[PDB]
Amino acid sequence: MTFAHEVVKSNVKNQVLFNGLTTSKLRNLMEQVNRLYTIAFNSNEDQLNEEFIDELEYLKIKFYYEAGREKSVDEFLKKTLMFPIIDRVIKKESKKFFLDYCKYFEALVAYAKYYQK
Amino acid sequence: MTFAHEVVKSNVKNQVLFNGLTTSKLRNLMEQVNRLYTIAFNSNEDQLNEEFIDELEYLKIKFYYEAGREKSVDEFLKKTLMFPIIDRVIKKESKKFFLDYCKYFEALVAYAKYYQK
Amino acid sequence: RLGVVRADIDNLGATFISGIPEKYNSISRTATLSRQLSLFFKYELNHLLENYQITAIYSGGDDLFLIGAWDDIIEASIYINDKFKEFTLDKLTLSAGVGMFSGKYPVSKMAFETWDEFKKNILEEKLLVLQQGFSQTDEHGKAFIYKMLALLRNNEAINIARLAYLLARSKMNEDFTSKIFNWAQNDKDKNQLITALEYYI
Amino acid sequence: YSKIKISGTIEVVTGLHIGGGGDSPVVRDLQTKLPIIPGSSIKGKMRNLLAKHFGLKMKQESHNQDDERVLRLFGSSEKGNIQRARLQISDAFFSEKTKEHFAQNDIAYTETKFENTINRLTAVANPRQIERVTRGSEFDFVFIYNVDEESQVEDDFENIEKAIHLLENDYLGGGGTRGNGRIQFKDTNIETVVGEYDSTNLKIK
Amino acid sequence: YSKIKISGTIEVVTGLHIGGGGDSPVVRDLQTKLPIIPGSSIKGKMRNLLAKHFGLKMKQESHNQDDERVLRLFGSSEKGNIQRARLQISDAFFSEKTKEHFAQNDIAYTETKFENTINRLTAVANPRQIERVTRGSEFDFVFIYNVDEESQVEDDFENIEKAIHLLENDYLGGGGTRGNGRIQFKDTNIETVVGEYDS
Amino acid sequence: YSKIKISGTIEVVTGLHIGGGGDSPVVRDLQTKLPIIPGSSIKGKMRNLLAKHFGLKMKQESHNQDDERVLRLFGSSEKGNIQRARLQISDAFFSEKTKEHFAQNDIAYTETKFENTINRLTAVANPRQIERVTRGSEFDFVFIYNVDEESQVEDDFENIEKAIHLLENDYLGGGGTRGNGRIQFKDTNIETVVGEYDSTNLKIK
Amino acid sequence: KEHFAQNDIAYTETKFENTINRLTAVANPRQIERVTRGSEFDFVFIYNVDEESQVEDDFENIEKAIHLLENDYLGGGGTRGNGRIQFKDTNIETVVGEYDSTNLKIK
RNA sequence: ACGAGAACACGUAUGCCGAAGUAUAUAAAU
């Protein structure tokens, strides 16, 4: 996939990023992701426990609140199909897909941090 | 492509190397490349597994992130044509070319370590 | 181990018969030439050997068959070549070979086994600087040197890079490591450094 | 040649910050990717403190030659002396109860706390983020004690007792003076895994 | 060798905002989800004020070399001279009695204070928000003093006592100027825990 | 004449540092580029501890002569009273199950633990980095015990069982006192490979 | 040879060893050159059956010999952890005389 | 009826032994 690099390069507009998005504006998001991630790591089976599915909904709630609070985060999440991805994750409930999600989001962060003021 | 391997001596300036590049910020790259090298050693046939390819994708993602974090490393990666060779390796999906790349990276790294404050 | 050096005069067939053409080939004169060669090979061979842990096994005619300690054998062989080049006024030359053989070997089998380039370049230049460096930096045991040997023996460029890095991990003075690296780059100087270090052990 | 095993539990009073792996992460394991306190830190801290407790000269401060009883406890074998350590400190692991309780309360193990380094004659407070383990977490530890000589176990155990108490009113980890690293020891147990030595009158608190 | 414990309790007097986590929240203890005072804050307010009360040369400011009494009291080793921190300030947490009283009297743990912005020549009202910790609450803290010289303990303790008074009069945390940061100390207790020192 | 096979796996509780290649790496197999535990390591540590178990004289220590039973187990054949060795300790190979496991969960085989050191009178830090085999990885080991005397079989097995226990509580490799390399054994097994000698009543914990 | 050249693997390993003096606890470094793991050797045995009525017996014996070696070592340090070998792809053919070899078996 | 014939470059020992990812620096000026 790595459609992330395409989105970030397309958003290099005039030197603004998604209309001025910054990595420190993502912090809690990634933090939350990382938490789930390590929990996700400790589990063995691919079937994700109901508590983890509730935590996935909690991660989506965080994303929605952050998008509502900051307009630039909203644009980023909207274009990046982040909410579609999360919904599809919730539908799938499979660990491997979740790990793929983690990688994609981390790539997003890395590419964005690649082009910053 | 070996001119990019002896260019390291061409980048010995005054008294910093690659604008102050140190192996302390490049150790992560060596570990990641070595981890994939052992997986390639386990692989018997030439045609790389798709999960291995995604591993290459993650590798390049790490490359971009490391270039973003540190400027001298960014100069190293760009001035040595790291990303094009990475993409080429991904394109070729051949083990043997991958080993060639790893040897190239090893030469770069070692030569870099030879010259350090 | 023991060292054995065997040497023969190269131009002795011509010297004994043709010697000096057309004007001094008197019977007495070639006799005196023979006499000088004999007296040298039977007296100087006694005198010069004083400082070497060597036993004289066969000396005479044009055959020199000497055995002793490897280092002592090499050193005395050098000494004997120089002394000969003095006494022959650089007119007669010798070809000599030294082989290292394990102790208690049947010598009847050792015998059948058996210059300025060697003296000035290898022993005089490389050997001394390597010795000084290894004197200055300790712990550099046969492990470190043996890794060097491995690096040199596989003559490939990636091995050149490996040798560079390994040298970097040492703590030898930059001049010493750079000299070894420069010597390794040159095929002739690498072969010479290899020989010097093999002598080192 | 018997071996006395010591088990116990590290309860983290304030934040704990090893920071071995580093923007600069703490030591976090690999099979569970849960943070652990590498023993090397534990042994070093306990050793430095116990050395301070006994005498320590500037010439002694030169090259880490320390008081002889401590030396017997931890081993130097440096001045051509035959001294292998009789007390080995292992690593600590994020014990299961901790993970369980935190999961059933949905709490992270690790916090990021942000600091503002103020510069004099500049009035600029630069933000530096430090990652530290959350409070109330626990690890389990095992120490191994070796009896090289019978009539010295009690004397060495007295030195251990002092060093264990020293760690409870000190900081273990990074930069404790900014208030991170306070720990305690609980549920001490002593057993002799191998041998015929009695460890019942023996106690650590 | 000897270690000196200090047990005591801070009471908050004016609204208090440290707000490390920054609608601009305050630091919180994650196992309790409750306010704390990151003892780093104590250390910093302390050292800054003490430098202020002692000599603080402009060159000394630029070079961050602090007064020798200050530097020795808290350890710096930034000028090359090895110096170990002689006092550690740890964090602090809510008191059991404080939390019990809050629950009994239904006292909220945090207050949101509106900060209205008024501009001259326009007087345009754009409220801002900020959070404060409930005033009057008490935290239990610890100060651990280490003895490195049996003759320096008295002088170091004298400096600590005067500094405690300075911290009480001044403001701790951010927005000290607007009325956030006045705390008091109570129930100081002194007791050496390790060693044979007389206190 | 019988040869008795012992099989099982070695589980790394805390990181392992065999590290014969010398930054400061671990020994690796050259066909797979994977960690190994050379049989010299295991065999020597077993001999060392089991010898220390029994009484050893100062002269015996200097001449490496040990107790008659340990020697008969391990062989000296150095002077005079020669004894042909009896238990051949094979090497250890990074088992397939753990290789697949790490691949599936994307886990490194080996970590680079960063460590530090505070020299005295300077308090100045000089860092180091040390490679450690990731914990929980499993090695396969094979022991071959030979019956040079039928009468003594359970006694020899009991001796090596004590050495196995000693290894578990202690450590292999380096950094043992600093925390590295405490190991455990799992799924041991015995089966007579050559001869006509039963091995059912045999056991090794 | 072809596999190693392709995979760029050295043929021979240099193992570092160490020995500990007791009552001194000093370190004495050692170096042993070992053949690489996994290499294969092509071996040839020749058995001249001088007695038709014994060859079966002999092969049984040779079988046992081979079998023992399967769980034992060759060369030095075999107690110390080197030299275990394996036998694969054994084929037996008659090359002199007219004696059948379709029933002789060695693993 | 081959300067032959028999003959494991074997047996002992491992990478140790000590090192603390450490040293100050307010989530801040409305």
Explain what the structure shows.
This is part of a larger assembly, with two copies of chain A (117 residues), one copy of chain C (201 residues) and four copies of chain D. With 117 residues, chain A is mostly helical. Chain A contains six helices and two strands, in the order αββααααα. In chain A, β1 and β2 form a beta hairpin. The relative contact order of chain A is 0.19. In chain C, 60% of the residues lie in helices and 15% in strands. Chain C has nine helices and four strands, in the order βααββαβαααααα. In chain C, α5 packs across α9 and α8 crosses α9. Chain C is elongated, with a radius of gyration of 21 Å. In chain D, β4 and β5 form a beta hairpin. In chain D, 22% of the residues lie in helices and 27% in strands. Chain D has one domain. The two termini of chain D are 25 Å apart. In chain D, the strands form two sheets. In chain D, strands 1, 2, 3, 6 and 7 form a five-stranded antiparallel beta sheet that branches. Chain D has a two-stranded antiparallel ribbon with strand order 4-5. At the B-C interface, α6 of B face α7 of C. Chain D binds one RNA strand of 30 nucleotides through α1, β4 and β5.
Oligomer: part of a larger assembly
Tell me the radius of gyration of chain C: 21 Å
Described by strand count, sense and barrel closure, the largest sheet of chain A is: 2 strands, antiparallel
Task: Give the CATH level 1 class of the domain at 1-121 in chain C.
Answer: Alpha Beta
Structural class of chain A: mainly alpha
Number of helices of chain A: 6
What fraction of residues of chain A sit in β-strands?
under 5%
- The N- to C-terminal Cα distance of chain A equals 27 Å
Number of E strands of chain C: 4
Report the CATH topology name of the domain at 1-121 in chain C.
Alpha-Beta Plaits
Strand order of the largest sheet of chain C: 2-3-1-4
CATH level-4 homologous superfamily of the domain at 1-121 in chain C: Reverse transcriptase/Diguanylate cyclase domain
Number of strands of chain A: 2
How do the SSEs of chain A run, as a string of H and E? HEEHHHHH
- Main beta-sheet annotation of chain C: 4 strands, antiparallel
Structural class of chain C: alpha+beta
| SS summary, helix count of chain C | 9
The end-to-end span of chain C amounts to 12 Å
Shape of chain C: elongated
Instruction: Give me the strand/helix succession of chain C.
Output: EHHEEHEHHHHHH
Quote the beta fraction of chain C. Answer: 5-15%
Domain CRISPR type III-associated protein (chains D, F): 9-183
Family (chains D, F): Belongs to the CRISPR-associated Csm3 family.
Organism (chains D, F): Staphylococcus epidermidis (strain ATCC 35984 / DSM 28319 / BCRC 17069 / CCUG 31568 / BM 3577 / RP62A)
Binding site for Ca(2+) 1 (chains D, F): 169
